[PDB]
Structures are given as structure tokens and as C-alpha cells.
Amino acid sequence: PLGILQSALSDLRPLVTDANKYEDVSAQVAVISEKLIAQLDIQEQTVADLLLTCFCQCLIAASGTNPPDRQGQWPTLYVKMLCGHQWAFAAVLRRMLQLLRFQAPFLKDSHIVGLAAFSIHLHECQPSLQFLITGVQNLEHYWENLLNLLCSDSVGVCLKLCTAAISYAFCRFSELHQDIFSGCVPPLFLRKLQYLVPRLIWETRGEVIRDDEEADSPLNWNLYALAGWKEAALSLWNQNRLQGLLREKSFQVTFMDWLLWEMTLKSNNDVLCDTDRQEYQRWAVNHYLSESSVVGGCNGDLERGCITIAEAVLQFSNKSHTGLGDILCRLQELICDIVTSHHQKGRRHFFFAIFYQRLELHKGKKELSNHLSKQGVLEMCCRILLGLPPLFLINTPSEKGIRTLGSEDFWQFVNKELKNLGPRGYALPYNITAHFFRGVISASVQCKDSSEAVNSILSATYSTCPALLISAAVGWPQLDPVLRSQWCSLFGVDLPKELRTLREQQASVDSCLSQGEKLSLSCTPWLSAAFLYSTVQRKKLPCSRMLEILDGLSSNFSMVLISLLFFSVMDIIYMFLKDGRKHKDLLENCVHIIHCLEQKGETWVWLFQMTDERKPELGLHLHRAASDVFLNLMPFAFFWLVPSLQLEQVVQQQDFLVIALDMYHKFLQLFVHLDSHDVFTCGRQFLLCCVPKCQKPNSAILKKMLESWEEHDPELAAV
Amino acid sequence: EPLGILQSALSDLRPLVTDANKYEDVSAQVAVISEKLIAQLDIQEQTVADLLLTCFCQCLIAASGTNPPDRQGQWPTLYVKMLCGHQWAFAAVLRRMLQLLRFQAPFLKDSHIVGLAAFSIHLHECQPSLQFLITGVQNLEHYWENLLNLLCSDSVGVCLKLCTAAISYAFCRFSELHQDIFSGCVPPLFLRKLQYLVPRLIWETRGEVIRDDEEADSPLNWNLYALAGWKEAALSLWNQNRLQGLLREKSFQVTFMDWLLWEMTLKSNNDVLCDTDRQEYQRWAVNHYLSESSVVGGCNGDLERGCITIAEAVLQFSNRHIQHSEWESRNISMLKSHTGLGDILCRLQELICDIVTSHHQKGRRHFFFAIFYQRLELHKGKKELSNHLSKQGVLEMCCRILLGLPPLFLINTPSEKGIRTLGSEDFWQFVNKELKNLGPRGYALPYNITAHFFRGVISASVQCKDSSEAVNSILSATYSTCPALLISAAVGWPQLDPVLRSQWCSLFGVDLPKELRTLREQQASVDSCLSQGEKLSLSCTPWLSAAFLYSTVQRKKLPCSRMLEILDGLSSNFSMVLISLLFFSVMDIIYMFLKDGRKHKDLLENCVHIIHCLEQKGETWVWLFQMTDERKPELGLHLHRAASDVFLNLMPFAFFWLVPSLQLEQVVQQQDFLVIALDMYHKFLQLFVHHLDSHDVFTCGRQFLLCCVPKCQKPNSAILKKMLESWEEHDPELAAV
């Protein structure tokens, strides 16, 4: 079956020497007549390399008699025959894939030219392949896959190839007006030889000289008797007809496609040393940075440069990576020229804007598919800030003869779209809450005092952006030596008065836990109850040894006992989302509640209310530090822990019923069972014994329906 | 049967060790007989090694459980002796140890590691174990670094689990005596990598120094055999008050340079830390070594010694990484993964931004440049081999560094009395000795080191009061001290203007100064008059206008005939443009020669056209060819001090191509001609020690000498034909003429 196939398919070469006078047809009829009978199986893995190779053979057979200009009426015919079938033309594609992926690094130097000429001739026939494993579209959705995988793994081959699917097309498909010629070759080959050449082959970047002695002449078809691959792709980049062709729009290269090619080329694959791979870029960036905007580029707007780089980085996420690090180093190389200038007119606002607009597209709530992309882009938004620090980009000083050091930005980004980033809820992670401190330490040099500015910053930080101090406290032990060393490195004097009170509080806590000394209180009941909580929770000590050491008689006591209830009902959850069912610390809260009762009341509902109607100050200094992933999930905890109490939760409380309903409304808007929604009866019971506004028996019968509002809104007016 | 008896013996040695049976050791001598009955990547046997090493690695863990090491016996010493007494097996086990540590580092157990660590310590105790027939290593000590400086780069989580069991075994074997001589049991190097790998991997022991003085007994009675992990066995040992008072001596002292030399070599891949976590470690360490004393090796609290010491290492780690490149004709050779380099250079700019941004600058920068004046003196001309020349691999790092910095460091910023004037005197004195780098052009620098400068003076005037009266002062002090920078702008204007303009418009929207503007005018008086022809303006300084014109021509691909017709004919500043236009063409010829050596005729025609265009005025063009400073008018120095020295060593190679292509009589009415001709021939010989051009020179510097200046009438051509003794007679002939 195949022996005769190899014979026939090999009986072609003798024909094509001089007698190529339309007789290469009946042999094609025979090829097709005998081909009728025949995971990369062996039937296909072998026939492919048999059809293809006949090309690499016949081409070289005929390229000795005459060049391709005059001959070349067989190839179109052979390829039209091949494409005439379906179960074979779909094997050559995958075979060439495997043959340029695995063996590509070393196959041959003349089994290549026998692949370009099969690419091109696969273009002038525009065949149909709508059905295939992956490629659903026409070829144009196949060249890009191949070329991209290849230039990501192997570079030298990509150029060895691109510069051979061109030279075969200025010889062939010549002698025709320059208006329709450009439709023969595909665009991407040129759109990529506009990129590779000046990367590998220097001397052609625009530095040295333009040598030209043979510019207007059909270049020699010498690839079969050549001298190297550095004069077949340079005797082409210097031909006028091409160098004047890389100006159309059908194939441009702009400063958002350069990245997505260079930002995915992993070292250990390239062919350039480090201190050349880091000159290519510094040349490129500074060539798409002095280029018009109608073309891909930005005139001189460093701002626009950084903007584009960030917008590209965000569009690649779709850990350890090497290429991305170079881009994130060029960011610094660019920015460090800004902070040392103190624009005061174009300031950090130009940057953060990007995030806000990349973070609105994912507002179309759906089936657990966009939230993921949201946090995935957010983690990258964070990784960046850690990748373009001179470490005080996040600081907005001023100038009126002095420098004030304020930071009016990064306080909104945090309060809005960063606090909902990491675990533990109320806190941030310990990789971004150190940049702010190691930044105020490093920007406190410009001023004249260097010990007062820091105090002003950290005194302002109490009102706005409190979620940073808590993230420090929760992560202080691995943060003290850092600063204690930085300061001594720069100045070498005592510390200020607002970076050591935290140390004093930690030390007091520690020295008081071992024995017990009725801990004091620094008039700040949402700080001094974070230390006290985190130390315990890390050293595994229980409750009894947590609040047994408070000395509250008339000072700030209830607040230090409510902050703990908050921090204790925001970690019942981190132990639910994290592969769990229920955690045993609610006893701590049932004890804190009894301790608040022993005092003069000091109600606890400020937490379980989302609006800002009458929530006292700390009650809205707390929720301004949480994450909207939890606050949308409190009712769960509310109805978990409530049933452990009765006969005092209402009759001596204020605004209970209202809050219970405000919650039970949201307990439904989550989904769209018996072990989760059982407080039906609970809410039904609290009514019969509550602060009777009207509540005679109406709301005891209305819970038998889905209208907690059909009559409640009016049933409150009678209060 | 060298095997059966072997396994029988190394098995009977198994149970006999659970108890320290007195005198039950001669059974070792039996293995001596067996081995004596049996005697690159060797694989001939390559099993005796494992057969003999597993004996230890198994008998140890088999006995341990009955008694701790100290009360174990005198077994391992005798074993190691019966091994080393045959210096062929001792030449193998080493090889298998290293081969299985490196290649299959992760594919190992948690019980064989200690079996190698204890064996290593026992080796160290038997120092008389010294072999010479092991290529690559002379003594024993070398082996330790040989394997560990590969382990600590290919895989870090095995240089810790192997350098902890050693200590946990030594502190259980020799922890009965040796109040002072304890130091000397373990090998030193082990006890250094710990001090570098423990904190890095785990943070709970970074900065804490003193917490208490509670006395301890010993680690948990050799718990490694049934440990619960390593984060607590490496931590129950860092606190042992007997150790922390041990890594203070000199032979266990890590330092700063010795740290950079190890962090650079970490492969980014195969590491264990995410890229956003191995930069906190560095941002901490760099600060932990700046607050120290110099006796330890760390800085004393300053910052200069913290940058000098990071540059002096990059200029010392690349030397062993020449790492050339080639793509066509690929020789299969993997590339070294992304080294920790770069990162270090990012923690070096977070530190320069803290001594230029301050309130007490006193902006001196003599340092950081005298550090480069040394590596270029280690091998000034040649390191006995032309592989890493000055302008090859050291002047490409004095740039990779000098770029990653801000564009302000290159400028001084004095603050004498708060006035804060501007200037530069340590980048000029230095760029006048790094222009020799760019051999491509010769009359220019590269571009990426010409933007920063012009982009710096603009980011420094800010600090001053009038941000547009210093620039006019700098760029006027220039034109007389550092020409080579402008001519690299002229050659690059159309890629540079939309940066300066945008910057000066983004800081504060005020009109430009009178020195970043003159250039736009001198460029627009060109890009137009080349179109359709009008005239040229001929601003004050010639050698800048000429650069503009010549480079613009080259960039637009025009011929070399417009350049000569759009020009004044009655101006006093005409010739001084043509001279420069000749100089640039010469240099272009010379560049074309150092690229597939040839001549590129057309330029030889351009130059003769120029010489004829300036010959009907009575001037003197033969003083470019004076490689001295004797009498060259001031226009010569301001050009030669911009030209590389790779080229002026070739100027003769271009003086005998376009001299004979002139008339034989219009190159003699000049002043002191032959004094350059023969003074250049003298240099045309030193090059040989092209070759076909020796004839044209031997004749052209031989026929002129008859109808030449009134210096000699005879015996000078005869003398020149005598031999290469032009000097022996010229030294006396020049006396008169």
C-alpha cells in the first residue's frame, strides 16, 4: 500500500528538471488515486513526514535548473490536491507543530525552507478548516499560536524561519504591482521580523551607519548555497522595497504588543547574556517613548509610559517569574526620576486611577466567576506597589519653604479597594503595611526636624486609615527590629514619641500576662485591645487569662470590651470560609457580654447595624477597617451566637427588633438549609417577648409569609 | 566473591554495636581482607561506595535508641580507619556522596542526611586522611566548599537539613569535655552557612539578641531520628547559649562582601521564597550590616561604605561570567538561570535616593568613580590575554550601574551657603575616559548615556531658586570642557527634543532657556534648507553645525553633493566647517574598515571634493594628522578629545588612501607637511608587528620627497631607501628645516 506510494510520490523528482510543461498532473492524479487508501497515531505520524518531505526534496531538485520565478506551477497544484482531502491536511498541521516544538532546537538547516514554502502556499489557497481540535478559525488563528509558542521557547528558529517565508516571496510572486503584492505573505511574519532582528542582530538598531550598495534588485535565492543566517536576513532588512513597506497599518508594532511578547519570554531559553538583555530594553522603551501617538507610542509623557506598562501587566495575569521582573525594574528606572523632582502638579493621582477603572468592569455579579478575577487583579495591584518602590512613591510632600510630609493618597485606595484583600479580616498582610512605615522613615530625611513630621503623620493616621495601625499591632514582633535598625542606620539617635508607645504597650501586656498587674489603658480602646488579643491568640492562652487583668472601674473599659467582641466575631468567620463548620470561641463572647452586663449596661448592637444613623464614634472607626466580604456575612454569626442567650437580650436592650429584622432580611438575599436556616423559629419567638411597640400578635402572624415589610414600616410609625 | 562476604560482614557488624561490647572491634579487620580481595563519572564498581556508606547510615540509626551517641563506643573511629587504610575506596565514597547530593538532591530521605553529616564530621576528626590523586582537589578542606557552594545555589532546603544534623550530632558526641577546644571538632564552613540560611528561611530569629540567661542541658537527646520537623530542631539550637557564644570567633565570622558573593549566585528558580519575600530579607540585611563595627567586616554606620562595597562586588562577580552570546550554529549549552543579580542593584538605588534627597547634602561624588579607576588598572592594556578588555566587559557595567541610578546623581548639587549652585566635575573628567567604549562610531557616545545627563540638569535646577539660569550656565561651561556629549545629542536630536520639551512643560509651563532652544533653531535651519535649497545660518560654534548637517544627510539618505552647495562662500566660518566634515568622513571610513575590511570608495571621492572646495582659499588641512598637542589650533583639540583611541591608532590607515588620490603638487605648498608624513609612516609599521598597501605607501612617501619643502635636496630619499631608519637621519635633518 505504501511502498508503491513512496515510489509514485518519489517518481515526481525525475519529471521536474526541464520538462515541467504541465505534465506534472497525471502523476498527481496517481498520487491522489493511491492515497485514497490509508494522539498522533502511526498511520498519520508517518504519512505526514512522507507528504511533506517530498516538498523539501522536489523544491531542491528544481532549484538547481532554474530559480523559482519561472517555474512553480506544480506546488500550488500539489497543495490544492492535498487540501482536497480532509483527514490528512489536518495531520500536517499538528505534525509541523510537534516538529517545530520538540525537535526544533536541532533538526536540520534545509528541512526549514521546506516548511516556509508550505506555509505560504497554504495562504494563496485560503482553504477551510472550520472543524479541528483547537483551531476553530481560519489559519490566522493558527500562525499566532505556533509562532508565539516558538518564540517563547526557541528564538533563533523563529528568525531562521521568518526570514525564509519572506525571501521565497520576493523571488516568487514578484513582477506585479506593489498594491496587491502585500496580500500574498501573511502579516504576522513581518509584524515579528520588525521585532526580532534588532533584538538579536545589533548593528541595525539605528546607531552606526546605513550601508547600501545593492538596494534595488531581486535578492539572490542563495539559501541552498549560502554562507550563514546573518546575511540572508540582513540582505533583506536593507532592501528598499521592504524597509519602505513596514509603515502600513496592516502590520504595525505598538507599545502594548512589544510587552506582551517580551513580558512572556523566560530566561534560560533566550540567547543573550543578562547585560545585553538589559540593554535591548533600555533601548526599546526609550524608542517607543520618543515616538508619536498616531503610531504606537507616547510623545514624551513618562506618565503615559508607566500607565501603559501597568495596564499591560494587569492584562497578563490571565510566585516566581523572570521576564516580568525586568519590566518591573524599568518602572523603577523611570519613576525614580519623578520622586526626586517633586512635580507637585502631576502627582500620584495619575497612577491609582488605572486600578479604579480596571476594578469596575467586574461588577456584573455572576456565578462565582468575576469575584475571583477581582481578587486576582487586586493581588497584582499589590504586587506592583512592591515592585516600583523607591519606597516613598506613596507619600505626598509639599513645598512652601518647608515640607509637611502628608499623604492624602493611599488612604482612599486602602479604605476602598485594598482592605478587602487578605485573610484575618480586619487586617492587612505583612508585606504592604511595612512600606508605609519604612517610607515615613525614609522620607523623614528631607525635613529639618525628622522627629516631628513622623509624629504628625502617625497622629493623623488615627482618624483616617486606622486599618494600618491594627495591621501593625497584629504584626509588630516581626516589625520592630526593622525600624529599630533603619533609624540607627540613618540618624543614630533616640526614637520618636509615637513609634515607641506601641513598644511600651506590647511590653506592658507581656509583663502583665505572666503574673497579672491590672494593665493600664492608653486612652485608645481600639489599639490596646489588638495587642491583648493577638498575643493571646498566638500563645494559645485561653479567655480567663485574657480579661481577668482589666482594671476598669470608671475609665475606658466597655470600649476595650467591645473591640474584643468585634475581633472575636470577625474570626468566627475566618474559621468558616477556611474549610470549617463552626469554631468554639463564642464562649468568649458570651462571657464578654456578661461582663458588660455587670457594668451599667453598655449595650452591644452598634456592630450589627450597617447604616450610620446613631452608631457612636468607635462604632464607625471599626467598620472602616473591615472587609465587605465579611460585613455581607455577619448575619450568619449573629444568628449562630444569639440562641445562647435570652431574657436579657431585649427587655433591657435598645433597638433589638429593628436590628433583628434588618438582618433576617439579608439572611435571605444571600442565596439565589435545615442545618443553616433554623432561626426561623428563633425570630418568631423573640417577638412574643420584646420591646412592645405594637407587637401584639401581628408580627407573630406575618412571619408566616415573606413580608417583613408589608406592614412593619407602618407598624413602626406607632412607636 | 568480593560481595557475599562483604554483606555478611557489614551485617554481622549490625547487632554487635547496640551494646558497647568491650574489645569487639577486630571484626573490622575482616572487612580489610575482603576489600583487599577486591582492588570522571566512574561506574566500574560505584557500589562498594554505597555498600560501605549504608553500613554507617544504618548502624547509627539502628544503635541510637539503645544509647545516645556519647555513650555509644569507639566504633566509628575504627570503621573510618579500616576504610581509609586503602586509598582507593576513600577516593570513591566522596564521589558518590557528592554525586547523589547534587543531582538527586530532592529525591532523598530524611534519615540518610544525618548519616552523611555524622560521617563527614568523623572524617574531619581523621585529618591524617589526606589523598593527592583526586583531580580538582588538593586537600580535604577544599571538598567542603566544592560541594556546598553548589548545594547552596541549586537547592537551599538541603544545605540546612544537612548543616543542622551535623551540629546536633557534634553537640551530643563531644559534649562531655572540651570547655575551650570544642571549637576544632566541627569543620568551620558548616558553622557559617547556618548564620546565613537560618534567618533567611525563618523570620522568628532575625534581630532578637538577648532575652534571658536560662541555662540549658542539651538538645532533645538526639531526637532527629523521630523528629516532628525542622523548624523546631533548627530553633532549639539557635538559642543554645553554648552556640551563640561560639559564632563570634574569627574562623566562624561571616562578613558583608562574603555575603553578596553568595546571594548573587542563588538561582531565582529552584529557590523556596516568592519574589515578593526574598526582597524583604535583603531590605533587612542591608540594614543589619550597615549598623556594625569594621572589625567584624561590616560598616560603622555610614552609607558610602555601603555602596562602594556593593559596586566592588559586582565588578568582581561578572569577571567569572563573561558569558558570551551566539545564536546561529547553536552549540547545545544551557544558560545560567536568572541570578540574584539585579535585585542587588535595586537595593542599591533605594539607598542612593537617601543621600541626594536630604537637607545637608554637600553633594560630593568623588567616590563611586575612584572605584572604577582601579579595575581599569588591574589590566590597563591586557590581562596577559585579550578576553575581558577595558572596553569589553567592565565599561559595560560602569554603565549598567550608572544607568540604574537616578539622572541626578551624575550632577553635584553643592550647597555652599544655601545658594545651591550647579556644576559637574567628576562626570566630565570621567567621560573623557569612557568614550573609548563605543567603537561603532568613534566621534560619539551611545544614546542611553546622553539622555540622563540632559535629563538631569532639568531635574536638578528645581532645587535652585531660578530654575532657568543654572542651565544656561552649565551648558555654557560645557562647549569648552566636555564636547563629546553634545555631538551625541546632535546625532540624536529628533529622538530627544520631545522629552526635554515635555519635561520643562510638566514641571512648570514657562518658555524654554536660551540653550535648549538654539539647538532647535540650528536644526530647523537645516531640515528645511535641505528641502528645495535656501541657505544655511552658520551659528557660532562650527563643529556642532557640521554635526547636525552631516548626520541629517546620513539620516535622509541624500547624496554627498547637497552638503557642499548649501553653504556660505564669503563667511569667515566656512572652512572650519569643511575641516570637521572631512574628519567625520575619515572616521566613517575607518569604521567601514573594521567591518568586513574594505574601502567604500565613494567616501574617498567625497573627501577629495571637500579638499578641492577648500583648496582655492589658501588654508591648511594637514593638522588633523598630528596625534599630539604641539601647535594644533584650538579647533583640533575640541574634536580629538571626543574621538576614541581605538581609531587614532588607525588614522595612518586612512592617510595613505586619500593622499595619493590627490594632486602630486597641491599637498606641498602647505606648512611642515613631511614632518607628518614620515612621523606617521613610523607608526604605520608598528601595526604590522593593508599588507598589499605597503607598496603604495613605500612609493608615495618616497616620490614626494623630491619636490618637497626646502628641507633636503638629496640623501633623504636614499636614506629612506636604506632601511627603516628614517629617524637616524631625520633627527638631524629637522635641525635645519
Numbering used by the authors:
A (entry chain B): 632 to 669, 693 to 972, 989 to 1342, 1356 to 1402
B (entry chain A): 631 to 669, 693 to 1342, 1355 to 1402
Relevant lines from the article:
The FA pathway is triggered by stalled DNA replication forks at ICLs, leading to the activation of the FA core ubiquitin ligase complex. FANCA and FANCG are critical for the localization of the FANC core complex. To understand the basis of the FA-associated FANCA mutations, we determined the cryo-electron microscopy (EM) structures of Xenopus laevis FANCA alone at 3.35 Å and 3.46 Å resolution and two distinct FANCA–FANCG complexes at 4.59 and 4.84 Å resolution, respectively.
One of the major classes corresponds to the dimer of the CTD of FANCA. The side chains of FANCA are well-defined in the 3.35 Å EM density map, and clusters of bulky hydrophobic side chains unambiguously guided the tracing of residues 631–1370 (helix H3A to helix H13B). The dimeric interface between the two FANCA CTD molecules includes an extended network of interactions involving more than 40 H-bonds, 10 ion-pairs and extensive hydrophobic and van der Waals contacts. The FANCA CTD structure reveals a long path decorated with a cluster of positively charged residues, providing a rationale for how FANCA might interact with DNA.
